[PDB]
Design a protein around this ligand. Structure first.
Ligand SMILES: *[C@@H]1O[C@H](CO)[C@@H](O[C@@H]2O[C@H](CO)[C@@H](O)[C@H](O)[C@H]2NC(C)=O)[C@H](O)[C@H]1NC(C)=O
Ligand SMILES: *[C@@H]1O[C@H](CO)[C@@H](O[C@@H]2O[C@H](CO)[C@@H](O)[C@H](O)[C@H]2NC(C)=O)[C@H](O)[C@H]1NC(C)=O
Lengths: 49, 50
């Protein structure tokens, strides 16, 4: 009357193929907060009485 | 059906993105001072031309 069976093998997950990476050289720039700086010369005369 | 197998459940750790976060920006820090000396100077040196 009562009859059972063994379970058969299963499909195991495939190992994912994986990511591909591009080799490159990179230079990262940011916002400039430094003021523009340039040298100048002042000419004036102090006066007093 | 009965099974001779022992289960095991593995789920990959999902991706997670980190957004940029700042408590205070440097503009708020520059504004923290009660008197920005530069702006006071620029305003006050316009009196003759104004
Ligand atoms: C990176 O390159 C490999 C090269 O083998 C890709 O392999 C592919 O694998 C998928 C399975 O998802 C197949 O559909 C493609 O036919 C394969 N291509 C080749 C040329 O083999 C791999 O998929 C690439 N990266 C990603 C994220 O898929
Ligand atoms: C295998 O993976 C997880 C347990 O680590 C289960 O998946 C989640 O189950 C919850 C309820 O517990 C559901 O609300 C979610 O939708 C399921 N998926 C995710 C991504 O969380 C899953 O049930 C486990 N397998 C078995 C047979 O229980």
């Amino acid at each position: 009357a009562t009859v059972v069976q063994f379970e058969q093998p299963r499909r195991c997950p495939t190992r994912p193929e994986g990511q591909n990476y591009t080799e490159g050289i990179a230079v990262v720039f940011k916002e400039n907060i430094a003021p523009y700086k340039f040298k100048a010369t002042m000419y004036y005369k102090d006066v007093t009485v | 059906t009965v099974s001779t197998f022992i289960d095991l459940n593995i789920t990959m750790l999902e991706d997670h993105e980190f957004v940029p976060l700042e408590v205070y920006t440097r503009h708020e820090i520059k504004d923290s001072g009660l008197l920005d000396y530069t702006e006071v100077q620029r305003r006050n040196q316009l009196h003759d031309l104004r």
